Amino acid sequence: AQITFVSQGGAYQAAQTVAILDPSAKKLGITINQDSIPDAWPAIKTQVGSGKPIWDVVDTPTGYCLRGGEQGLIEKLDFSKIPNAAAMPEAYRSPYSVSYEFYSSVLAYSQKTFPKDAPNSWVDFWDVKKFPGRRALRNHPIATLEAALMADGVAPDKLYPLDVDRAFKKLEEIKPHITVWWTSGAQSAQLLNDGEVDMEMAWNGRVSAVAKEGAKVSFTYNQGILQSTSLCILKGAPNLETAVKFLNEAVDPVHQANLPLHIDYGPGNPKAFETNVIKPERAAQLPSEPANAAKQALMSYAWWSSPAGEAAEKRWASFMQK
Amino acid sequence: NAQITFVSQGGAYQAAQTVAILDPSAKKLGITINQDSIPDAWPAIKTQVGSGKPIWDVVDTPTGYCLRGGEQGLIEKLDFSKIPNAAAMPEAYRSPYSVSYEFYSSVLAYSQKTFPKDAPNSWVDFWDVKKFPGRRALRNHPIATLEAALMADGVAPDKLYPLDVDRAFKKLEEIKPHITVWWTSGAQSAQLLNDGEVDMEMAWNGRVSAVAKEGAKVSFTYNQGILQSTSLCILKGAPNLETAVKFLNEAVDPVHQANLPLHIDYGPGNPKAFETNVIKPERAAQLPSEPANAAKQALMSYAWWSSPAGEAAEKRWASFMQ
Amino acid sequence: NAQITFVSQGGAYQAAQTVAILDPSAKKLGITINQDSIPDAWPAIKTQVGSGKPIWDVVDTPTGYCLRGGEQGLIEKLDFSKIPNAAAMPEAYRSPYSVSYEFYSSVLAYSQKTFPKDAPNSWVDFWDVKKFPGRRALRNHPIATLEAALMADGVAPDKLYPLDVDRAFKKLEEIKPHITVWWTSGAQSAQLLNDGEVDMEMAWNGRVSAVAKEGAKVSFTYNQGILQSTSLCILKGAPNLETAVKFLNEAVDPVHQANLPLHIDYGPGNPKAFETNVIKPERAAQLPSEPANAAKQALMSYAWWSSPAGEAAEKRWASFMQ
Amino acid sequence: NAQITFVSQGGAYQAAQTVAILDPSAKKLGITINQDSIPDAWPAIKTQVGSGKPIWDVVDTPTGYCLRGGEQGLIEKLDFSKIPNAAAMPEAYRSPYSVSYEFYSSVLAYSQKTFPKDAPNSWVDFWDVKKFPGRRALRNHPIATLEAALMADGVAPDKLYPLDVDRAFKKLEEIKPHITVWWTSGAQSAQLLNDGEVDMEMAWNGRVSAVAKEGAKVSFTYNQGILQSTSLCILKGAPNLETAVKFLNEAVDPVHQANLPLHIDYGPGNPKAFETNVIKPERAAQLPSEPANAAKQALMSYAWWSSPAGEAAEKRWASFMQ
Amino acid sequence: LAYSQKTFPKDAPNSWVDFWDVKKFPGRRALRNHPIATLEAALMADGVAPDKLYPLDVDRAFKKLEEIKPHITVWWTSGAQSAQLLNDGEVDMEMAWNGRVSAVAKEGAKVSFTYNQGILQSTSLCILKGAPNLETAVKFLNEAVDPVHQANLPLHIDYGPGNPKAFETNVIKPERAAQLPSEPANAAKQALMSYAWWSSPAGEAAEKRWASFMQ
Secondary structure (H helix, E strand, O other): OEEEEEEOOHHHHHHHHHHHHHHHHHHHOOEEEEEEOOOOHHHHHHHHHHOOOOOOEEEEEHHHHHHHHHOOOEOOOOHHHOHHHHOOOHHHEEOOEEEEEEEEEEEEEEOOOOOOOOOOOHHHHOOOOOOOOOEEEEOOOOOHHHHHHHHOOOOHHHOOOOOHHHHHHHHHHHHHHEEEEEOOHHHHHHHHHOOOOOEEEEEHHHHHHHHHHOOOEEEEEEEEEEEEEEEEEEOOOOOHHHHHHHHHHHOOHHHHHHHHHOOOOEEOOHHHHHOOOOOHHHHOOOOOOHHHHOOOEEOOHHHHOOHHHHHHHHHHHHHHHO | OOEEEEEEOOHHHHHHHHHHHHHHHHHHHOOEEEEEEOOOOHHHHHHHHHOOOOOOOEEEEEHHHHHHHHHOOOEOOOOHHHOHHHHOOOHHHEOOOOEEEEEEEEEEEEEOOOOOOOOOOOHHHHHOOOOOOOOEEEEOOOOOHHHHHHHHOOOOHHHOOOOOHHHHHHHHHHHHHHEEEEEOOHHHHHHHHHHOOOOEEEEEHHHHHHHHHOOOOEEEEEEEEEEEEEEEEEEOOOOOHHHHHHHHHHHOOHHHHHHHHHOOOOEEOOHHHHHOOOOOHHHHOOOOOOHHHHOOOEEOOHHHHOOHHHHHHHHHHHHHOO | OOEEEEEEOOHHHHHHHHHHHHHHHHHHHOOEEEEEEOOOOHHHHHHHHHOOOOOOOEEEEEHHHHHHHHHOOOEOOOOHHHOHHHHOOOHHHEOOOOEEEEEEEEEEEEEOOOOOOOOOOOHHHHHOOOOOOOOEEEEOOOOOHHHHHHHHOOOOHHHOOOOOHHHHHHHHHHHHHHEEEEEOOHHHHHHHHHOOOOOEEEEEHHHHHHHHHOOOOEEEEEEEEEEEEEEEEEEOOOOOHHHHHHHHHHHOOHHHHHHHHHOOOOEEOOHHHHHOOOOOHHHHOOOOOOHHHHHOOEEOOHHHHOOHHHHHHHHHHHHHOO | OOEEEEEEOOHHHHHHHHHHHHHHHHHHHOOEEEEEEOOOOHHHHHHHHHHOOOOOOEEEEEHHHHHHHHHOOOEOOOOHHHOHHHHOOOHHHEEOOEEEEEEEEEEEEEEOOOOOOOOOOOHHHHHOOOOOOOOEEEEOOOOOHHHHHHHHOOOOOOOOOOOOHHHHHHHHHHHHHHEEEEEOOHHHHHHHHHOOOOOEEEEEHHHHHHHHHHOOOEEEEEEEEEEEEEEEEEEOOOOOHHHHHHHHHHHOOHHHHHHHHHOOOOEEOOHHHHHOOOOOHHHHOOOOOOHHHHHOOEEOOHHHHHOHHHHHHHHHHHHHOO | OEEEOOOOOOOOOOOHHHHHOOOOOOOOEEEEOOOOOHHHHHHHHOOOOOOOOOOOOHHHHHHHHHHHHHHEEEEEOOHHHHHHHHHOOOOOEEOOOHHHHHHHHHHOOOEEEOOOOOEEOOOOOOOOOOOOOHHHHHHHHHHHOOHHHHHHHHHOOOOOOOOHHHHHOOOOOHHHHOOOOOOHHHHHOOEEOOHHHHHOHHHHHHHHHHHHHOO
């Protein structure tokens, strides 16, 4: 018995392997074959459309599960066969997916440049007079638009539906003060590590990893953008039954709880915190810890997976080729 | 507690490295190995090393890039008096800047549904559309592709270098109208075999074996395969040089190395692995660098590919496609 | 009758080489030296050598390129047992792939009409717009320009490398509004001085010398000049390798070398030229590499410029100029 | 002590001038001739003359520029009663602003390896890819290229002008998909023939001759060649006008002029050179402007190229190249 | 800096810092599609004093212009266009030539402008080399800057005399003089354009960057 499981590789997938994949395989008595890809969406469309996908279970940003679900590419899950998922709050799942882990886009900064009074909101990030320094943002509209709108005074809990015109105007304002628009996590970490930028939006796991390596940098969860990936199963998956069994083990509280032990991302399953696996100190550094989550804007995957999301993506090229 | 960051290509391959090599090495040495992944490391290595403060220590990459990189001052000249295991390897398995890590092959893969009895068995067959009818795929890339085209034109695997590049392109022009798809990712090449979009293709042996093990009625031959390898090297200015040198020595340990093909269909970079008695005869017989399989194959010349003529050949690909 | 093709940068410089080095070497060796000229040989060298059949044999080029070239296998590793005049030069004047041919400087040049007395005498003066008012030019290129900026900021000429690139750019951004013209060719730089469009500029000393000979009231100082050189190398695959090797030996013969300064204001690549008694004392005192003159200057580090840090600095220049 | 600055296009061409013309002229007049080199003098001529203080006195440039320059008041009107050698040349060889200095051809060059018999012999042949298979190159510039396109479309060599530019471009668009490369430099055009990247191309006869003499199995025909010339002129505001005029007289001395072809495959500007018995019969047979060679060629019309139609043709070139 | 008195019946924008502050001074804006005077205004908006502009810090001017770009409704190319934009209320404020603003105001448009941080410019007479009527042209030049002739120009258009002696003739009435760009008190409020800077290579380079900027 076997499945093919795909995620984003790197430290993140190594972490998953120790905390989730190996224990599940042993518990279930199955072989979990792995693959990795930066962005699964184009491949999903192709694999599913063929009628014979090679992938069973995909770990992907949650909005793709919704979009794939809505377009008939992804299995409607039968939760009475996935009790660990069924027991999670309904906000942590969709008809097509279950939350797997939480990550943040955050305002990261150099402690050399800002030993005191670091920028602490997108308002600050946009204020090049009050907080001088080289800046970077991600070459992608996801989270970037949210940051622009908060920079323009929008409360973290009143972002959606995004006022995309408003967001782009703000981005155009900051553009001449943006040193580079990063394309990869590794690049965003290198920019902080070598001092090319004094502040930037970056995924929290990249920042903490490079700080662990020795870099004098840090970040704040204040006005962070709280996001997640989810597990889903491709329509036509060659090992549907075994995939379904795996989904249940993948969101097991203890397995979930071991994930933060190897990488700075929060468990998809909130019951993870009650396993007594995570040290209090470690728990307090996680993106999805209640106290950290309340400082952040919760990304709306309903918005991003809709036609407004797509339209915003299509505008991004126009904004960049500018 | 000392650490390094090790970078490879992710997916099943990096997971196998972790079980066979990284975990046991980290345990033996008493260090933490932080992992990262990237399809092509070199643009990043240039940027990282150029900054003087690289975040990566050790990179696993196709051997030819180690030669190019070492020549450009991007990776460390290795002191083999500190790497006993590497020093004990034959000189043809290392360079001043790298040590062979694992062997893989580009092979003629084919559908068993299409060829139940008389499957194509050479690039000559691959080019013979009348004799072996069917949809075909090749990689959108000059490496290995040029070699196969020359072998199709009757050139013996061990007489390829220096490559007759005009001759290879002429032969490729001939087949071009019969190519259904020029693939760009390993996963794509697997999907093509799995859903029957192609009846035969060049593909990395690891991708074929994987989709076959998943249930696909497909297979491949090592005959006229292109035998290749990746090597480990250390970034110039690596933050954890000393630890990284120590890891390199554990990484090419006969035993650790002999364990790699227990987990994936690739050959050990260190041929001493075959003298360890961990790889059973039946299993070795399936590996790219097993003596009898190697004898059927073209051994890629990284000296040729990394030379001015190799660069010129690469630059011509761009205009050959489109 | 044996022959080679010799490539340099044309102009007064190549004319001066012909009289002092080329013709006497050809006559001495009984060969024909066919000449060519190009502003920048690198791109053609890549193309020619990558073809396996270059048309050029011996190239005269800024020393930094020789280093990168040799590493990448574009030029011959020389056998100095066959080039005794070179072998007897101090090791600092040669590489495994090349030999010092000639020394030139980037200097602070200035109008004597504008500065009858108290002319600017350092890059600190050049940056000091209130003390030394007037129109100024710099070269549109990072080489020498960054060093001048660091010296402007108080760095000592013998303590420049490795360059603090950030600091150079910061000083450069400060003078930028005060730069009248960023020149792109030697001839342009001479014309700017000659017609009074600038009152001071960085310029090559040969260009300034020539304009002053024509009668223009201009001069320069060696103080804080950037001392640079070109070297001779042989293309890999040179069609006349043997003859080329013999020419190199004649090219750095002390007497031939000593005659070069008789016809242009550059110093000999071979310091033994000063011992030949060919050059008049008064003339020697005008040369870029005369000891007293060299001591006032920054000695360009071709090791630094040819390194990844140097490449990264060149890549930033584009961003800076726009 | 008298002095001038003389500028030409460098390379073998300028070295050849130095031996045959510059040095004997300097010695005869008792003056110093300072040399410079530039690929294309026109933009610098405009800047230099505009300033009122050009650094150059005498310019050797394609004849069309001298005419354009004279018409725009940038070039000195010559008093021919002070230049007897030029005044004794036929009117067709001089303008009010300039005197013919040497003749060169753009010719159909080809590989004797591809064409050991029945070589392409006209532009109609060059355009017929069916009758004459092989890789082709033309110059990336409209000069001579348009004339060839018109001849390929059946226009007689002596009925080209004024050029039917629309018709020339349609014809060039027709051949475009069969042009392997559009060369930008003479050295490049020589390398393309030498390494067999093309089997035929338009090239300057001097480049083809030189590579042939170096050992390349290539040749060319003068049939339908485009016969061109450079001319000497004096810049308005020349700082050494009087000396420059005296030099002009020596530069077109029949014996000096006759010596040019002994060192390079270009014809004398002054046809009286053929009366000196300096040029041997065999040698003369190789020259662009020998009567029988000239009779086979289209004589470039500098009236047409110096006019507004020439400028407009140049502006269309940029548009054409896509 | 011209503006609408309908949008701003009180507390009008009064400097380039005001023009750049879209929060404090809401409304549609236009600038000229050309770097001349535009760069000077951008620098003043970034806090540079009117008498400390030159030589222009062009990099800094462009960063500042890029900042305002998403708030510029239109980049006008002609004077008539700039007048029409104010007249029909398509913008509430814009940089414009004072003559255009004055004329549309006099026609009945509820608009005005301030000389504060204005950019004070000039045209000059010159004779072309090879002029077919050089001698006559020279004589004309003398009459063209006659104080009384010059003093009459401002009676017909809102531009100041090239020749300051015009103010000595008593042809220009006090009220009228108060409206002119080069009257001492108006001139004192403005940045005086440096033609040395614009005629130099830096000026040319600034112009070449303009095309690139407009996207």
